[PDB]
Design a protein around this ligand. Sequence first.
Ligand SMILES: CC(C)(CO)[C@@H](O)C(=O)[O-]
Ligand SMILES: CC(C)(CO)[C@@H](O)C(=O)[O-]
Lengths: 287, 287
Amino acid sequence: AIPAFHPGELNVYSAPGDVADVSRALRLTGRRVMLVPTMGALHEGHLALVRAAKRVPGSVVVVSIFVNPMQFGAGGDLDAYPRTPDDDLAQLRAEGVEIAFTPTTAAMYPDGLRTTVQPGPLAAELEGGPRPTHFAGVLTVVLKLLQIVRPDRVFFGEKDYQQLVLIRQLVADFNLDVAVVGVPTVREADGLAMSSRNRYLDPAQRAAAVALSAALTAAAHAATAGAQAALDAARAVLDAAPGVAVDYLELRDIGLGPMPLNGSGRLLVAARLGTTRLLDNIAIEIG
Amino acid sequence: IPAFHPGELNVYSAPGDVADVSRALRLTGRRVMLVPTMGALHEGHLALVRAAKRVPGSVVVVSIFVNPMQFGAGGDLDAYPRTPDDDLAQLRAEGVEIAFTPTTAAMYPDGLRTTVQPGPLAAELEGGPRPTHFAGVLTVVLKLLQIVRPDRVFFGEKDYQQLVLIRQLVADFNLDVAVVGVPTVREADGLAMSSRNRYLDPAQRAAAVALSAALTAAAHAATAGAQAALDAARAVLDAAPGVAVDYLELRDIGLGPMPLNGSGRLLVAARLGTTRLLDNIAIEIGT
Ligand SMILES: CC(C)(CO)[C@@H](O)C(=O)[O-]
Ligand SMILES: CC(C)(CO)[C@@H](O)C(=O)[O-]
């Protein structure tokens, strides 16, 4: 028997088999299953992903909420991770989401860490520098979510651009039959990319943090003058802010390969403010 | 949908072609069965084909692809037997409707980028002296399953460790496919069929019967316990001329981090000249 599904309502399932069965049944009923993977602690950024999925005609939106231990560094703090289950589910009901998938670590990893996904070399770069096993954790859980839910489209934020690119590689490399949709970064009024981590910034840090987005947007417009102009402009803005330890500022092509001295690219930055690591990135057109 | 002629063997090289045909078949009610092979087909592969063909409403897809990723060096890859015309002739005689014969470029357009990292079992037995072998097997099988999307996939028990690892792949990545293991097909004297048996000269072919004789002797000696079973097998192998045993191990059936307890699998690998042969058999201890 297929588990119960109440249209127009938020149906919560914790068992992978249950959401797998409902997703299959729904796809056969004329719905297009959209998957929005999350680790909970939902904010406007996540809601933009939800809204992007909702607008596809015939959509039934599946939002997974799972704090994946495999992507937390040996030093990452799994237990400190924010958990607001009831509030999360309330936001999803408010958005008209019909399915929330909330598996336990045990249900997702019943045999512990055994077969896993090994990302390509891009996973050792940029964010992979301080966290070398992070993306293996991300790709492994995303592949599993894709196989459990079998969505027609899966939605990811461009905020975590390197993550997005690596998922696009996973999909191409493993011949996955799903469309990957990247959703533009949602930002606060002054440009700061929305993130659960922003609340950890004290006032001086929060004001200084505007430098990341300001540096990227200045770079985007300075780009008519060339790659070097764009980089120097972004660097000057970061240099005008106190307490912002830049870990990297790199211009690459859109797939994160070497950036041409002309054409489309992506400028990415990461910096530490006190004990908080912030990231941002932006599309760049050179020349 | 590319051309498809029912009751005839349709050969497709393009992944997109077989994927479209498979989906179209799945959509009309036919159940797609996949039999992955590296060609050089013999009666053991035909038993896999026959097992697939008897599933009601089945359409059988046999893939033939000598996967470069699972070979250590170009020498072994170049040495693998290739008998394309005989392979297709045998598939036609078996009533197979689809043969999937991809090129290396179509399967690895980006070289080795995202890949499958098998669990600890891949570093043992066959994997000991070939640490990347099973990562190559699991990566290609994962890709084949995503391309073809079969309801069931068939593997021979002859390469038992491979079969176990594929069951791990399916469980660990939540793949929606049933893995079917088919009993080893043997020559009249017990020799397990293998595309490598062609490299045994008359003397070696005669001596090679020791592997299956050792295993079956062990299976019957087992009523007296594990030591008796192992010693019976060792005695047979030791009496064989020109048989160099690589390993002879008795493990729990999952070959995992579990001690042997009642139901096991006895595995052997031995070299006859430059030809390495494998065989294995079910063992019940004290039964
Ligand atoms: C994609 C994801 C849900 C995987 O755990 C996580 O990395 C996230 O929220 O970006
Ligand atoms: C499973 C397989 C087809 C993957 O290339 C190959 O290892 C084989 O023939 O056993």
